[PDB]
Design a protein around this motif. Structure first.
Motif, mmCIF file in Angstrom:
data_model
loop_
_atom_site.group_PDB
_atom_site.id
_atom_site.type_symbol
_atom_site.label_atom_id
_atom_site.label_comp_id
_atom_site.label_asym_id
_atom_site.label_seq_id
_atom_site.Cartn_x
_atom_site.Cartn_y
_atom_site.Cartn_z
ATOM 1 N N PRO B 42 0.806 -1.108 0.107
ATOM 2 C CA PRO B 42 0.069 -0.023 0.033
ATOM 3 C C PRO B 42 1.153 1.141 0.046
ATOM 4 N N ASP B 43 2.012 1.255 -0.033
ATOM 5 C CA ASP B 43 2.896 2.330 -0.096
ATOM 6 C C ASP B 43 3.293 2.702 -1.571
ATOM 7 N N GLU B 44 3.435 1.671 -2.362
ATOM 8 C CA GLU B 44 3.876 1.855 -3.726
ATOM 9 C C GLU B 44 2.641 2.195 -4.198
ATOM 10 N N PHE B 45 1.678 2.019 -3.851
ATOM 11 C CA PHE B 45 0.130 2.070 -4.516
ATOM 12 C C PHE B 45 -0.038 3.625 -3.958
ATOM 13 N N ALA B 46 0.267 4.260 -2.769
ATOM 14 C CA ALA B 46 0.010 5.360 -2.099
ATOM 15 C C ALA B 46 0.980 6.487 -3.187
ATOM 16 N N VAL B 47 2.043 5.998 -3.640
ATOM 17 C CA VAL B 47 2.945 6.923 -4.537
ATOM 18 C C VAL B 47 2.213 7.114 -5.991
ATOM 19 N N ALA B 48 1.709 6.039 -6.366
ATOM 20 C CA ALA B 48 1.052 6.093 -7.827
ATOM 21 C C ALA B 48 -0.031 7.105 -7.643
ATOM 22 N N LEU B 49 -0.793 7.105 -6.629
ATOM 23 C CA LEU B 49 -1.838 7.798 -6.168
ATOM 24 C C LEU B 49 -1.756 9.477 -6.135
ATOM 25 N N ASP B 50 -0.495 9.817 -5.522
ATOM 26 C CA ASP B 50 -0.230 11.037 -5.166
ATOM 27 C C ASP B 50 0.162 11.830 -6.515
ATOM 28 N N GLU B 51 0.743 11.213 -7.559
ATOM 29 C CA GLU B 51 0.782 11.744 -9.101
ATOM 30 C C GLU B 51 -0.643 12.391 -9.567
ATOM 31 N N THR B 52 -1.428 11.699 -9.555
ATOM 32 C CA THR B 52 -2.833 12.149 -10.188
ATOM 33 C C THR B 52 -3.752 12.700 -9.350
ATOM 34 N N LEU B 53 -3.931 11.999 -7.846
ATOM 35 C CA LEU B 53 -4.911 12.474 -7.142
ATOM 36 C C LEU B 53 -4.385 12.932 -5.658
ATOM 37 N N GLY B 54 -3.164 13.728 -5.899
ATOM 38 C CA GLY B 54 -2.379 14.128 -4.600
ATOM 39 C C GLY B 54 -3.085 14.981 -3.925
ATOM 40 N N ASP B 55 -3.782 15.840 -4.336
ATOM 41 C CA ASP B 55 -4.221 16.828 -3.674
ATOM 42 C C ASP B 55 -5.728 16.482 -2.882
ATOM 43 N N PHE B 56 -6.006 15.257 -2.976
ATOM 44 C CA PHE B 56 -7.167 14.591 -2.295
ATOM 45 C C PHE B 56 -6.750 14.361 -0.698
ATOM 46 N N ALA B 57 -5.501 14.185 -0.396
ATOM 47 C CA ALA B 57 -5.214 13.916 0.816
ATOM 48 C C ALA B 57 -5.954 12.973 1.749
ATOM 49 N N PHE B 58 -6.178 11.801 0.753
ATOM 50 C CA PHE B 58 -6.757 10.637 1.167
ATOM 51 C C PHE B 58 -6.474 9.890 2.746
ATOM 52 N N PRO B 59 -7.480 9.728 3.463
ATOM 53 C CA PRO B 59 -7.128 9.455 4.919
ATOM 54 C C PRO B 59 -6.435 7.822 4.719
ATOM 55 N N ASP B 60 -5.567 7.516 5.614
ATOM 56 C CA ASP B 60 -4.927 6.363 5.529
ATOM 57 C C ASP B 60 -5.778 5.243 5.618
ATOM 58 N N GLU B 61 -6.984 5.335 6.609
ATOM 59 C CA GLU B 61 -7.906 4.194 6.582
ATOM 60 C C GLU B 61 -8.841 3.897 5.371
ATOM 61 N N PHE B 62 -8.871 4.794 4.543
ATOM 62 C CA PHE B 62 -9.505 4.780 3.250
ATOM 63 C C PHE B 62 -8.609 4.245 2.177
ATOM 64 N N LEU B 63 -7.368 4.796 2.079
ATOM 65 C CA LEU B 63 -6.596 4.284 0.942
ATOM 66 C C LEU B 63 -6.164 2.731 1.356
ATOM 67 N N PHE B 64 -6.154 2.518 2.596
ATOM 68 C CA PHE B 64 -6.102 0.963 2.970
ATOM 69 C C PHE B 64 -7.267 0.089 2.439
#
Lengths: 44, 75
Positions: B42-64
């Motif tokens: 989920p950290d490799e996934f978290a990085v991929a998200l930040d490129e396109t959807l970085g500004d969302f500041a997705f909560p950790d319980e959500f992106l899990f």
């Protein structure tokens, strides 16, 4: 510590609370979410 | 049927989108999903998200839970 809030929790709060700061902090958080959405949705 | 699996996955994701924003569109759910079917944690996934959807500041319980929805495609 507001990012971790669930939507329906932001919604039940804005629709029931009385706290002047909290109410305003939930609006601008509920807004910020649908803000970034509208931003990304524009390009895609 | 390995396409019913992708659809279930995405469907389980925008379900989480409705719990976080009350919104629900398949283009976003798919955008996220297709940022994870290549990563392993989920950290490799978290990085991929930040490129396109970085500004969302997705909560950790959500992106899990989303990563939890993607890893389910393993079985």
């Amino acid at each position: 510590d507001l990012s971790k809030w669930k939507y329906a929790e932001l919604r039940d709060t804005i629709n029931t609370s009385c706290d002047i700061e909290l109410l305003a902090a939930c609006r601008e958080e509920f807004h910020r979410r649908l803000k970034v959405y509208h931003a990304w949705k524009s390009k895609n | 049927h390995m396409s019913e699996a992708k659809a279930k996955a995405i469907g389980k994701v925008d379900d989480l989108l409705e719990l976080y924003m009350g919104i629900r569109d398949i283009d976003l759910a798919t955008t996220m999903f297709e940022a994870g079917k290549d990563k392993s944690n989920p950290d490799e996934f978290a990085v991929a998200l930040d490129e396109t959807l970085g500004d969302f500041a997705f909560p950790d319980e959500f992106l899990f839970d989303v990563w939890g929805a993607i890893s389910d495609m393993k079985q």
